[PDB]
Amino acid sequence: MASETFEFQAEITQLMSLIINTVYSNKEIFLRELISNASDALDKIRYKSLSDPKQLETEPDLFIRITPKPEQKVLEIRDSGIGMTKAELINNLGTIAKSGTKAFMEALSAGADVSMIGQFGVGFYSLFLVADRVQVISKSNDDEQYIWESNAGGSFTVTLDEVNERIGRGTILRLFLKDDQLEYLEEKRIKEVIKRHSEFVAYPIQLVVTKEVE
Amino acid sequence: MASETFEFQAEITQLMSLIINTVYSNKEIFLRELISNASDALDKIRYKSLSDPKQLETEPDLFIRITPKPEQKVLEIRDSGIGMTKAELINNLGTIAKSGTKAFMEALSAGADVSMIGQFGVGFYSLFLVADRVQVISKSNDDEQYIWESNAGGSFTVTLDEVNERIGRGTILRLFLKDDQLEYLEEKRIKEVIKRHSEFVAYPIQLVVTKEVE
Numbered sequence: 132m133a134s135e136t137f138e139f140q141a142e143i144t145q146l147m148s149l150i151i152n153t154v155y156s157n158k159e160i161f162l163r164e165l166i167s168n169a170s171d172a173l174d175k176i177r178y179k180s181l182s183d184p185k186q187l188e189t190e191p192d193l194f195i196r197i198t199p200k201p202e203q204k205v206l207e208i209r210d211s212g213i214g215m216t217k218a219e220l221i222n223n224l225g226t227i228a229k230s231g232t233k234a235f236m237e238a239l240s241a242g243a244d245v246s247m248i249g250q251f252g253v254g255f256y257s258l259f260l261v262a263d264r265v266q267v268i269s270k271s272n273d274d275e276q277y278i279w280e281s282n283a284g285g286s287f288t289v290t291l292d293e294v295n296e297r298i299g300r301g302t303i304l305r306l307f308l309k310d311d312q313l314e315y316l317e318e319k320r321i322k323e324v325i326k327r328h329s330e331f332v333a334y335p336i337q338l339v340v341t342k343e344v345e
Numbered sequence: 346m347a348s349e350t351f352e353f354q355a356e357i358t359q360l361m362s363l364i365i366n367t368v369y370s371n372k373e374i375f376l377r378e379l380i381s382n383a384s385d386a387l388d389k390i391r392y393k394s395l396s397d398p399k400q401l402e403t404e405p406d407l408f409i410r411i412t413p414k415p416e417q418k419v420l421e422i423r424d425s426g427i428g429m430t431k432a433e434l435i436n437n438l439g440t441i442a443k444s445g446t447k448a449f450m451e452a453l454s455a456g457a458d459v460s461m462i463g464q465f466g467v468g469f470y471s472l473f474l475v476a477d478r479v480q481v482i483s484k485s486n487d488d489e490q491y492i493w494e495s496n497a498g499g500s501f502t503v504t505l506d507e508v509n510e511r512i513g514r515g516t517i518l519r520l521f522l523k524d525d526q527l528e529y530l531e532e533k534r535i536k537e538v539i540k541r542h543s544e545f546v547a548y549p550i551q552l553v554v555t556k557e558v559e
């Protein structure tokens with residue numbers, strides 16, 4: 132109840148406009164970047180749990196889950212990783228500069244391939260290749276569940292979560308797919324994209340598929 | 346935020362103890378009864394929509410969805426039917442007598458088969474054959490989302506929903522399966538049970554299955 136608006140650090144706004152507007156051919160790379168963030172987030176909690184085992188109690192199962200929601204033309208990528216607090220969502224996703232933000236844009240301009248985005252540490256923004264709106268729902272052991280939302284505009288919002296399912300711990304990336312990128316809602320397409328660019332992932336990757344009983 | 350307790354009409358409490366304690370052999374009948382309630386609830390909104398089309402706008406897709414959640418040993422049966430208001434959950438699920446409640450118990454005592462429960466209009470309670478706890482999450486166009494919860498005790502609770510996913514319209518029956526009835530979480534078992542006792546259902550029945558990418 133009651134949002135909170137924040138301005139995006141100027142360069143992040145540029146990058147976003149760039150990503151969401153590049154005619155780029157190979158938009159499927161966004162899944163690789165998101166699954167990668169999910170994996171690192173899971174490494175984080177695993178490592179932290181080394182000296183603080185109780186930390187995994189909020190969600191003992193470590194996994195990455197992709198859930199397509201046709202009716203709402205939404206694609207969700209979830210992980211039971213370390214999660215983010217209200218402060219971290221604000222920091223990590225928009226108000227703090229980000230080292231490679233400008234460097235990547237400069238590299239892109241020089242001819243670099245969009246797929247290099249992840250090497251600049253800003254792969255998250257690659258989601259705008261297939262979605263024009265996103266909701267990052269997170270729950271860290273250190274805070275409540277919050278929704279961070281953006282549509283590539285110069286500003287984003289953070290609202291305490293009182294509308295989504297409770298996630299024990301972790302993050303959900305709710306991607307509102309563009310009208311021409313609804314192929315990522317299909318199991319085959321998803322399955323194949325995950326196969327080629329994500330072969331060495333330490334955690335199970337679950338695909339949630341809704342099938343009408345024969 | 347803030348529950349509200351209510352006592353169960355005495356006979357419903359009896360029936361529940363009976364169901365949750367009957368050694369009965371054919372516990373799988375609960376799915377047939379629940380899918381049946383789901384169907385009737387969908388008929389209700391379809392019919393009402395005949396003269397009030399805007400009523401389907403909250404959720405244009407009419408369906409029944411079964412979603413097993415292993416980690417939490419939970420089984421969910423959802424429908425985008427008419428849904429129930431706070432008042433209706435209280436009325437329909439516990440505080441109002443219910444014509445066949447006593448008649449069915451008398452019939453059972455005479456030797457009747459538990460599967461007749463649905464003919465007495467109290468099939469919902471058959472869920473206690475496989476679950477020792479249940480949450481009925483509902484959203485009617487006429488109210489907010491609420492959670493009705495019970496564990497066959499003499500009382501139940503109703504809380505405004507600020508923790509579950511938003512359902513456009515309809516009801517979710519979250520069944521917390523008993524430790525020895527976890528077979529209903531399996532796709533095959535579910536698939537076969539649905540096949541035998543639910544052949545003439547007017548709406549699509551979707552099974553949500555989580556598969557780890559090969």
Ligand SMILES: C[C@@H]1C[C@H]2O[C@@H]2/C=C\C=C\C(=O)Cc2c(Cl)c(O)cc(O)c2C(=O)O1
Pocket residue numbers: 165168169171172175210212213214215223224255301302304
């Ligand atoms: C802050 C934590 C943990 C970090 O060390 C991990 C690696 C990358 C983080 C990138 C982010 O900016 C946030 C993020 C994104 Cl974008 C995502 O799609 C999935 C996630 O699970 C996280 C996250 O929860 O990240």
Ligand SMILES: C[C@@H]1C[C@H]2O[C@@H]2/C=C\C=C\C(=O)Cc2c(Cl)c(O)cc(O)c2C(=O)O1
Pocket residue numbers: 379382383385386389424426427428429437438469515516518
């Ligand atoms: C009140 C409405 C609509 C009624 O006319 C329909 C038929 C049966 C109703 C039985 C109930 O007692 C509530 C109920 C149950 Cl138990 C269920 O498992 C699923 C449902 O969708 C409803 C419901 O929403 O019911």
